Amino acid sequence: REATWVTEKPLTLKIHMHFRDKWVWDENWPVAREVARLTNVKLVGVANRAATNSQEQFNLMMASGQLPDIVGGDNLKDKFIRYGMEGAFIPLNKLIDQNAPNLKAFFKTHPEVQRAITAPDGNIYYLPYVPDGLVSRGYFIRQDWLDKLHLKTPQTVDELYTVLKAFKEKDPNGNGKADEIPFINRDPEEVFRLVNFWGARSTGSNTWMDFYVENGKIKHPFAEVAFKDGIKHVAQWYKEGLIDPEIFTRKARSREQTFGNNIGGMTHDWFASTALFNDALSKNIPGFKLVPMAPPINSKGQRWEEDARQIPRPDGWAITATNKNPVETIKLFDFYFGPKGRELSNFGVPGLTYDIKNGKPVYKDTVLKAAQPVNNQMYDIGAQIPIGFWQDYEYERQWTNDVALQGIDMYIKNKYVLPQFTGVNLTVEEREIYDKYWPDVKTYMFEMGQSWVMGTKDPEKTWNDYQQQLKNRGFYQVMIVMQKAYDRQY
């Protein structure tokens, strides 16, 4: 028996958690096993470990006439809310009030987080992934390549074009081959963010393809004429091979591949893990220096960083209607928001990945000096996963090197980060229109965006058809309710 036990009799519950297009919940995870030890509740995974589409797996699960005890994963907020109001997921308000002191105290001290997760009927249907920190992504460029080619740090988009063209054409890795790929990214969605260079938005928040507000008006980036004109330029950079030809396919290990083989010249990615490549490749590529770069002055004369940490993220977990132990489940959920539970969900397992030194969790040297970024290492053992948990920036600070720290400081100091969209409060019937049309519109927008970038569709020629399709798919019905909700609140 332990003091943290939420049940005297051992309990096993079924969880469907397919996430980030690769992983599933693993009961064998060191973190999972430690939480199970301390709480006396074991979670067994039922999701298909072979699938590469997490959202599709939720859809198949929901339509399969069977439900597990718990459903977790990334980008599930909208589905948690929709199916919660339908009755597939249970409300957590009373369960938290009566059984979850850590969460109850958390929500009282974080009203913005409570607001962001609450459904229009007043019910909380899931517990969120709550990130910790301020900045997220920044531009990184190969300083050693700039220096070798005798080029200054590009200050404008036009200067950046010249630099990236030089990376492509002037053999900075010195192997006599045109193998260099100037701009790379592990996130395909970042290719759309390049429209920032031409004064267009790609998203209002850390949530991909999110709405934004300009002069009291709700806008979606992909529907704007600025996007049409901006994506033409992105298409041109793709055509000229300045953007990775595999930008939509390469994905997770883009940095390991392109920086590891000394072909990648630039990216836009998180400060800590990206800067860590300087240390990992220090001997393999003598002089490798990937440095934070201020955003280039765009066509609107400004230096935009569009991305920032989003608190909370639209990720987490929920309790289903079929769950026969909702009290034990919410108590398990609450363990994650206590001191020890939070530490485990962030740092891993004590004696394995970290040690308590002077009362503080300190990562082992084997973790810090490892080839893999620490967040990657955490995923492997069941930490830093998109369950209902509260991230602790102290975990990240420990593997944020001086290059990363100084980049973070520069971005904070110079205020590059654009004001982030914190959402509007929809009514139930407004949300019905939202949930009906928006997911499919977003998918269509991505497909069109990819077609435009890759040159299979001409953005100028197809814009009229695209706008008609947006209307036919109900996008402007969604836009009407978005503006209505905004006008009501503000």
Ligand X SMILES: O=C(O)C1=C[C@H](O)[C@H](O)[C@H](O[C@H]2[C@H](O)[C@H](O)[C@H](O[C@H]3[C@H](O)[C@H](O)[C@H](O)O[C@H]3C(=O)O)O[C@H]2C(=O)O)O1
Q: What angle do CA 127, 130, 133 make, to 5 degrees?
A: 175
CA distances from 409 to 181, 414, 481 (A): 28, 8, 39
Contacts with 87 (C-beta within 8 Å, 6 or more apart), sequence order? 321
- By a kind-dependent CB cut-off of 5 to 8 A, residue 54 interacts, out of Ca ion, ligand X, none, with none
- By CB under 6 A, tell whether 40 contacts ligand X: no
How far from chain centre, in Å, is Cα 246? 20
- By CB under 6 A, tell whether 78 contacts ligand X: no
Applying CB under 6 A, among 183, 270, 277, 363 the residue interacting with ligand X is 270
Q: Which stretch binds Ca ion (CB under 5 A): 144-152, 157-165, 166-174, 343-351?
A: 166-174
- By CB under 5 A, tell whether 175 contacts Ca ion: yes
Give least dist CB 170 to Ca ion, A: 9
Residue 334, marked binder? no
Residue 104, marked binder? no
- By a kind-dependent CB cut-off of 5 to 8 A, residue 320 interacts, out of ligand X, Ca ion, none, with none
Strands (E), 323-365: 354-357, 360-363
173 vs 267 by CB, closer to ligand X: 267
- By a kind-dependent CB cut-off of 5 to 8 A, residue 177 interacts, out of ligand X, Ca ion, none, with Ca ion
Write down the residue that tokens 């132990």 correspond to. 325
Q: Which stretch binds Ca ion (CB under 5 A): 175-183, 240-248, 366-374, 421-429?
A: 175-183
- By a kind-dependent CB cut-off of 5 to 8 A, residue 396 interacts, out of Ca ion, ligand X, none, with ligand X
362: amino acid identity, one letter: V
Q: What is the secondary structure of 37-70 as a DSSP string? A: HHHSEEEEE-S-TT-S-HHHHHHHHHTTT---SE
Give least dist CB 74 to ligand X, A: 4
Applying CB under 6 A, among 26, 34, 74, 256 the residue interacting with ligand X is 74
For residues 39 and 37, give the distance between their C-alpha atoms in angstroms, rounded to a whole number: 6
CA distances from 121 to 112, 146, 183, 430, 439 (A): 17, 55, 45, 12, 21
- By CB under 6 A, tell whether 375 contacts ligand X: yes
Q: Which stretch binds ligand X (CB under 6 A): 33-41, 113-121, 240-248, 268-276?
A: 268-276
Give least dist CB 291 to Ca ion, A: 20
Give least dist CB 252 to ligand X, A: 6
Determine how many CB atoms are found less than 10 A away from the CB of residue 105.
11
- By CB under 5 A, tell whether 177 contacts Ca ion: yes
3-state secondary structure of 354: strand
129: amino acid identity, one letter: Y
For residues 275 and 44, give the distance between their C-alpha atoms in angstroms, rounded to a whole number: 36
87 vs 176 by CB, closer to Ca ion: 176
Q: Is residue 91 classed exposed, middle or buried when 0-12, 13-18 and 19+ CB atoms within 10 A define those classes?
A: middle
- By CB under 6 A, tell whether 20 contacts ligand X: yes
Residue list for the binding site for Ca(2+): 171, 173, 175, 177, 179-180
Q: Where do contacts with ligand X occur on this chain (CB under 6 A)?
A: 20, 74, 131, 187, 252, 270, 272-273, 313, 375, 384, 396
Q: Where do contacts with Ca ion occur on this chain (CB under 5 A)?
A: 171, 173, 175, 177, 179
